[PDB]
Amino acid sequence: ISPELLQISPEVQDALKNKKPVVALESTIISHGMPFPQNAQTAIEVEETIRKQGAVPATIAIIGGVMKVGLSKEEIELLGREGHNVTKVSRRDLPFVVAAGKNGATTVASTMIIAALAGIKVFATGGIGGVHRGAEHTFDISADLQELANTNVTVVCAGAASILDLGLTTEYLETFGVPLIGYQTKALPAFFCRTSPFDVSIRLDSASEIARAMVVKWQSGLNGGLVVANPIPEQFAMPEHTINAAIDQAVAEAEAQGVIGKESTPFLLARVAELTGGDSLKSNIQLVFNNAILASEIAKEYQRL
Amino acid sequence: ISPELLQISPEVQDALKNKKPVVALESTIISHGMPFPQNAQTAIEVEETIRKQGAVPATIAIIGGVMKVGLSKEEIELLGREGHNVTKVSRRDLPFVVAAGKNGATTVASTMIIAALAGIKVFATGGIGGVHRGAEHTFDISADLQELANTNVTVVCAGAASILDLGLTTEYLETFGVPLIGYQTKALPAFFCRTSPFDVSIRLDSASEIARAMVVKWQSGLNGGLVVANPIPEQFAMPEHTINAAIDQAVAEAEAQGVIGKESTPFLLARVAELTGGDSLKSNIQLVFNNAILASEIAKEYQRLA
Amino acid sequence: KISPELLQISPEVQDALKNKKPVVALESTIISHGMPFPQNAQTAIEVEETIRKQGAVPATIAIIGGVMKVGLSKEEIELLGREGHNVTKVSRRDLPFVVAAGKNGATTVASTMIIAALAGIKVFATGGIGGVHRGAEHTFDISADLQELANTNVTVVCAGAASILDLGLTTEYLETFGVPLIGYQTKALPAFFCRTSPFDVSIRLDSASEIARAMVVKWQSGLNGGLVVANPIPEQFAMPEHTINAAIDQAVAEAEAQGVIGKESTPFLLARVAELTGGDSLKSNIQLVFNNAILASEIAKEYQRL
Ligand SMILES: O=c1[nH]cc([C@@H]2O[C@H](COP(=O)(O)O)[C@@H](O)[C@H]2O)c(=O)[nH]1
Ligand SMILES: O=c1[nH]cc([C@@H]2O[C@H](COP(=O)(O)O)[C@@H](O)[C@H]2O)c(=O)[nH]1
Ligand SMILES: O=c1[nH]cc([C@@H]2O[C@H](COP(=O)(O)O)[C@@H](O)[C@H]2O)c(=O)[nH]1
Ligand SMILES: [Mn+2]
Ligand SMILES: [Mn+2]
Ligand SMILES: [Mn+2]
């Protein structure tokens, strides 16, 4: 509530009061999900994509201890340039970055929280956190899934990469009552891959259906979010053997180097990019754009209802 | 909630207005838990069982996109005849069946949600969903358990069959703060069987004690449901070895055949029925009636206090 | 507005809350099931006095004759101590039944957090929290304490937990559920008898003041749930690493061999470790409790200030 705690930029506030569609964006993908310059370049361009769809982007982050909804170009570039030097902020991290007046890059979890505080129901990203490979033994399970269990926001992603255990993730989502919606797909998108061995909970072929389902869900009091898994355009999909070989190697190296906890995902994405000579990153960028277009349509349709 | 979203039948409305005890019933048991004709026959008979006990049944389902509390005989017959062609609806499914104007059969989870929307505190079923065998590696855990964790409804069941991992299920219920009440039993009733190797969290010998505990729990702000595990009547209990052999075989076949997700429980129950020559189904019917009788008493004692 | 039949706050605690004086909650399972008599009672009363010396008001919580009591008389503390295992161990799933049945009960970290929250007390000192058990990846044995920390707004000051638990899995679980794990002046998670474990808290904070500010921001931002503050035992009282880990490993092996499960696990393990260390582990436990009460008092002061 307090302006000391939370600030929405004039553009976003205008859109909100005047009821234009707003699409939220996270910052961990910037600071920890991609290298500089590509991170900031992509963040700025995803905002522009949203605007060209006739919606209003709101990139969320913690700036100087303030939860910020909508960011300046300079702030986005700050997060990008600072990179790993900025705190990665999940639900358990959030109060401390705010209290200490520091900068932080918000994960899907923290971005969902802040968007919900701002009354934004639609959030685009590249991929969600989830159940990690070996989590049956390690218990390494993203707080993103608990946020999806509880917070009312639709998250548009490409599913997630096979760095995660996608099967266990689909089971987990069912247990916690979270819809996993395939956009024009029955198969659950694998991020770099358009398909995977696993299926979504329901296939929906239009943004309008998704928006209507959101309305029914929250009107009926079923709190929690919705995952929309949107397959990467075929043109930008990684070759399967290449990408799965790269992922399997990165996971092995992560194990050997003792990479654990919040350091896992940043480490893995960076290493896969390295092993594919940048191709995986270019794919990530395209899937982010695609997700922002779909998210724009969902937000439009939702505002209309 | 909009009339379009949620409709409570006049009988149930009057019952709630007039402070008469009401017992919710689910619909997944009808469409996916039992074959036709037995499915609709049982659903109608369980309603009558509740009325004979002096309570008012409310069967819950989604009909033409509307969440319905209390159903016509024709709607129940529909759910029974259509069977698997009706969508099985858990928490993650509910919004879409409603939005798309379709019919759906609600699981313990969805039925709890809807019952709670209507102010109904007592729900009779056959067996609850739970932790599946192998869940330590598959993560297959019923959304029913999360609903029990969070939604204010007492669910009367026979425990659950050993198609599930009952040990893991008892641990899960404890972690999530959910009472597992044995009605006149310390051993946890294993559906077809009156006992199992596992324990309920507390034994209570009267519906009155159960109702008192419900009132205290919710007046203390401890949100979430309660499981009442009620052993199948002695006449209908199945001999351990035959039934467990059938269950173990059905589980092994489901694993070999790659049966997963929401298809698992229906597959397992149908197969155990096939392997037992229909006996397991006859027992399932009887434990459902028994649960409706007890649930009727719990509802009566609960309404007495509230 | 909870009924006085269910919940009673002692006049001293009521006055403290009304006068904005810092209050520090204390649990009772540690008394009945966590320590032997007389040591359990003596420690409970002494820790109250510690808190008084630090300028705060202690509130020990328990269920007495069916009433959730916030603040306890010396006699009630002595009763719980003397009765020991005859007093019911009360977690979230137990709570409604001991209250409804008018019985005595000793409240775990989970129940104590619940009642503290009902009273509006934000700071709770204890010895160690429940958590993920060794083998929980197979057994699913995970303390309801962790779900209470996920959801209920109370800071719990502890020594971490002993290696009877799986501390690694516990740190993962806390992350998934959004619960801050604060090391007090330490990055490494304290292991109860041990100052340091081969694990890292989520954040190190060096002062009560920082902790209180974080509490304020967390709850004003609407992130409901608790915070764990893991405070290393003073060096003077720490147990020798090899001796204590040998004792713990033996106790765990014996518990598994004897089929000790569920709510009986932790009390059995702590008792056995105390036996195997000839009482030294208990003396350590007592000292870490006192240390935690001191830090908790400072956090309570700073919180009330803010
Ligand atoms: O392909 C990606 N997946 C996930 C992330 C980020 O990592 C977070 C998950 O991290 P963890 O589960 O450690 O909290 C996501 O919410 C998102 O911010 C990312 O940058 N790129
Ligand atoms: O003996 C039975 N157990 C469970 C069911 C149904 O199956 C649901 C659990 O399915 P799932 O875990 O797949 O959501 C229960 O809530 C109930 O509706 C049933 O029909 N028969
Ligand atoms: O060193 C200890 N750890 C934990 C306990 C008690 O055990 C409870 C956890 O037991 P369970 O997980 O079985 O609910 C804690 O909340 C606390 O009351 C204790 O006495 N001593
Ligand atoms: Mn993780
Ligand atoms: Mn399942
Ligand atoms: Mn346990």
Task: Please name the residue whose Cα sits nearest to atom 18 of ligand 3.
Answer: C108
Residue A180, chain B, CB below 8 Å: the answer is yes
The answer to whether the Cα torsion of C185, C189, C191, C196 is positive or negative is negative
Name the one residue in this structure whose structure tokens are 């039948």: B9
How far is residue C63's CA from residue C6's CA, in Å, rounded to a whole number? Answer: 9
d(CA C159, CA C58): 19
Q: Is the peptide bond before C38 cis (omega within 30 degrees of 0)?
A: yes
Tell me which residue in A173, A175, A219 faces B2 most closely, judged by beta carbons: A219
CB contact under 8 A, C218 and A94: yes
Among the bound ligands, name the one nearest to the CA of residue C84: 3
Angstrom distance (rounded) from CA A274 to CA A272 = 5
Task: For residue B188, give both structure tokens.
Answer: 């946890």
Give the separation between CA A28 and CA A21, rounded to whole angstroms.
23
Q: How far apart are CA C155 and CA C175, in angstroms?
A: 16
How, if at all, do strands A22-25 and B226-229 pair? unpaired
Instruction: Characterize the bridge pairing of strands B226-229 and C7-9.
Output: unpaired
User: Are C87 and C80 in contact, with CB atoms under 8 Å apart?
Assistant: yes
HEC per residue, A205-266:
CCHHHHHHHHHHHHHCCCCCCEEEECCCCHHHCCCHHHHHHHHHHHHHHHHHHCCCHHHHHH
For chains A and C, what is the number of CB pairs under 8 angstroms?
77
Q: How far is C96 from chain A (nearest CA, A)?
A: 25
Q: How far is the alpha carbon of C81 from chain B, nearest alpha carbon, in Å? A: 24
Residue of C nearest to A151 (CA): C223
- Asked if C100 and B213 come within 8 Å (Cβ–Cβ), the reply is yes
The set of long-range contacts for B181-185, using a CB threshold of 8 Å and a minimum separation of 24, is: B181/B210, B181/B213, B181/B226, B181/B227, B181/B228, B181/B229, B182/B229, B183/B156, B183/B210, B183/B228, B183/B229, B183/B230, B183/B231, B183/B294, B184/B231, B185/B229, B185/B231
What number of residues does chain B have?
Answer: 306
Q: Give the pair of three-digit tokens for residue B60.
A: 């819950």
Angstrom CA distances, A37 to A43, A124, C188, stand at 10, 21, 35
Indicate yes or no: CB of A96 within 8 angstroms of CB of C215: no
Question: Do residues B306 and B215 make contact, with C-beta atoms less than 8 angstroms apart?
Answer: yes
CATH number of the domain at B18, please: 3.40.1790.10
CB contact under 8 A, B1 and A214: no
Q: Rg of the Cα trace of chain A?
A: 18
Residue A192, classed as helix, strand or coil, is coil
- CA dist A120 and C96 (Å) reads 39
Altogether, the residues listed in chain C come to a count of 306
Q: For residue C24, what are the β-bridge partners?
A: C58
For residues B179-195, one letter each, b for 16 or more C-beta atoms within 10 angstroms of the residue's C-beta and e for the rest, the string is: bbbbbebebbbbbbbbe
Q: DSSP string spanning chain B?
A: --TTTEEE-HHHHHHHHTT--EEEE-SHHHHTSS-TTHHHHHHHHHHHHHHHTT-EEEEEEEETTEEEES--HHHHHHHHHHGGGSEEE-TTTHHHHHHTT--EEE-HHHHHHHHHHTT--EEE-S----BBTTHHHH--B-HHHHHHHHS--EEEE-B--TTB-HHHHHHHHHHTT--EEEES-SBPPBTTBS--SSB-SEEE--HHHHHHHHHHHHHTT--S-EEEE-PPPGGGPPPHHHHHHHHHHHHHHHHHHT--GGGHHHHHHHHHHHHTTTHHHHHHHHHHHHHHHHHHHHHHHHHHH-
| B90 close contact with A: CB closer than 8 A | yes
**Alpha carbon distance B221, B227 (integer Å):** 18
Ligand nearest to the CA of B135: 5
- Nearest-angstrom CA–CA distance, A169 and A136: 11
Dist. CA C205 → ligand 3 center (Å) = 25
Q: Distance (Å, rounded) from C-alpha B269 to C-alpha C303?
A: 56
Compute, in angstroms, the gap from residue A172 CA to the centroid of ligand 4: 15
**For chain B, what is the radius of gyration of the CA atoms?**
18
From ligand 6's centre to the CA of C121, what distance in Å? 26
| Ligand 3, residues at Cβ distance < 6 Å | C 27, 29-30, 33-34, 91, 108-110, 127-128, 130, 143-145, 162, 263, 266, 270
Ligand closest to Cα of B147 equals: 2
Distance CA(B267)–CA(B270), nearest Å, equals 5
Phi first, then psi: give them for residue C12, nearest 5 degrees.
Answer: -65, -45
Which numbered ligand comes closest to the C-alpha of B285?
2
Q: Does B137 touch chain A (CB under 8 A)?
A: yes
Report the chain C residue with the minimal C-alpha distance to residue A261.
C172
Collect all residues with Cβ–Cβ distance below 8 Å to B266 and sequence separation of at least 6: B32, B33, B84, B88
Check B220 against C92: CB less than 8 A apart. Answer: no
Tokens 């218990």 belong to residue: A139
Q: Which residues of B touch C146 (CB under 8 A)?
A: 175
Residues facing residue B154 across a β-bridge: B122, B226
Q: Do A95 and C179 touch (CB under 8 A)?
A: no
C173 Cβ under 8 Å from any chain A Cβ: yes
Inspect the interface and report whether the beta carbons of A215 and B96 lie closer than 8 Å: no
CB contact under 8 Å between A176 and B143, yes or no, is yes
Atom of ligand 3 nearest to the CA of C263: 13
Which ligand lies nearest the alpha carbon of B141? Answer: 5
Which is nearest to A292 in space by CA: A8, A18, A12, A24?
A24
B66 bridge partner residues: B63
Closest CA to B121 of B56, B191, B32: B56
| Candidate from A99, A113, A137 with C-beta closest to C214 | A99
Which residues in A lie closer than 8 A to residue C175 (C-beta atoms)?
Answer: 90, 92, 143, 261-262
Cβ-defined contact of B139 to A219 (cutoff 8 Å): no
Select from C26, C109, C115, C261 the residue to mutate for testing ligand 3; criterion: most ligand atoms less than 8 Å from CB. C109
Report the domain count for chain C.
Answer: 1
A168 to chain B, minimum CA–CA distance in Å? Answer: 6
Q: In chain B, which residue's Cα lies nearest the Cα of C110?
A: B177
Tell me the two tokens of residue B141.
């855990």
Shortest distance between the Cα of C116 and any Cα of chain A, in A, equals 22
Elucidation technique: X-ray
The count of residues in chain A is: 305
Interchain CB distance below 8 Å, A220 and B6: yes
Q: Amino acid identity of C44?
A: A
The pair phi, psi for residue A65, each rounded to 5°, is 85, 0
B262 contact residues in A (CB cutoff 8 A): 174
Q: Which residue, judged by its Cα, is nearest atom 1 of ligand 2?
A: B127
What does the longest C-alpha to C-alpha distance in chain C come to? Answer: 53
Optimal mutation site among B142, B154, B220, interface C, most CBs of chain C within 10 A: B220
Ligand 1: nearest atom to the Cα of A28: 18
d(CA C252, CA C270): 10
Phi/psi at B124 (5° precision):
-95, 140
Cα C125 to middle of ligand 4, angstroms: 28
> CA-to-CA distance for A82 and B157, rounded, in angstroms?
57
Q: Are A95 and C218 in contact (CB under 8 A)?
A: yes
Chain C interface includes A147 (CB < 8 A): yes
Q: Do A90 and C173 touch (CB under 8 A)?
A: no
DSSP 8-state code for residue A187: B
Can you tell me the distance from the alpha carbon of A93 to that of C204, in angstroms, rounded to the nearest whole number?
Answer: 11
Task: Record the tokens describing residue B201, joined without a space.
Answer: 């969290």
Burial class (CB in 10 A: 0-12, 13-18, 19+), B41: middle
Phi/psi at B154 (5° precision): -90, 125
- Who contacts B299 (Cβ-Cβ below 8 Å, separation ≥6)? B21, B22, B23, B55, B121, B122
C119 vs B: CB within 8 A: no
- Provide the token pair at C177: 């559920």
Q: Does residue C90 belong to the interface with chain B, where contact is any CB pair within 8 Å?
A: no
Kindly determine whether residue A171 and residue B90, on different chains, have CB atoms separated by under 8 Å.
Answer: no
Question: Are A28 and A43 a contacting pair, CB within 8 Å?
Answer: no
Q: Which tokens hold the place of B182?
A: 């044995």
A201-209, long-range: CB within 8 Å, 24+ apart, which pairs?
A: A201/A170, A201/A173, A201/A174, A201/B92, A201/B93, A202/B93, A202/B96, A204/B96, A207/A294, A207/A297, A207/A298, A207/A300, A207/A301, A208/A301, A209/B99, A209/B100
Residue B25 near residue B58 (C-beta atoms within 8 A):
yes
- Alpha carbon C31 to chain centroid distance? 11
CA of C141 to the centre of ligand 1 (A): 28
Hey, are the CB atoms on C94 and B202 less than 8 Å from each other? yes
CA distance A45 to chain B (A): 33
User: In angstroms, rounded to a whole number, what is the distance separating the alpha carbons of residues A129 and A109?
Assistant: 9
Nearest one of B132, B160, B140 to B232, comparing CA atoms: B160
Of B170, B176, B213, the CB nearest to C147: B176
Measure the N-to-C terminal CA separation of chain B; round to a whole number of Å: 24
CA–CA gap between residue C224 and residue A213 (Å, rounded): 27
Helix H or strand E segment including A61: strand A56-63
Q: Can you give the residue range of the structural domain that contains C248?
A: 1-306
**Residues of chain A positioned with their CB less than 8 A from the CB of B147:** 177
CB A272 within 8 A of CB A28: no
Ligand 1 pocket, residue A127 CB under 6 Å: yes
Q: What is the rounded distance in angstroms from the CA atom of residue A181 to the CA atom of residue C209? A: 45
Our answer on whether the CB atom of B106 is closer than 6 Å to any ligand 2 atom is: no
Q: Which atom of ligand 2 is nearest to the CA of A174?
A: 14
Cα separations (Å) of B164 from B112, B187, B265, C130? 21, 16, 9, 27
Q: Give dist(CA A40, CA A42) in Å, integer.
A: 5
Quote the tokens at residue C265. 């696990």
Neighbours of B233 (CB within 10 A): 15
The values of phi and psi at residue B165, to 5°, are -95, 105
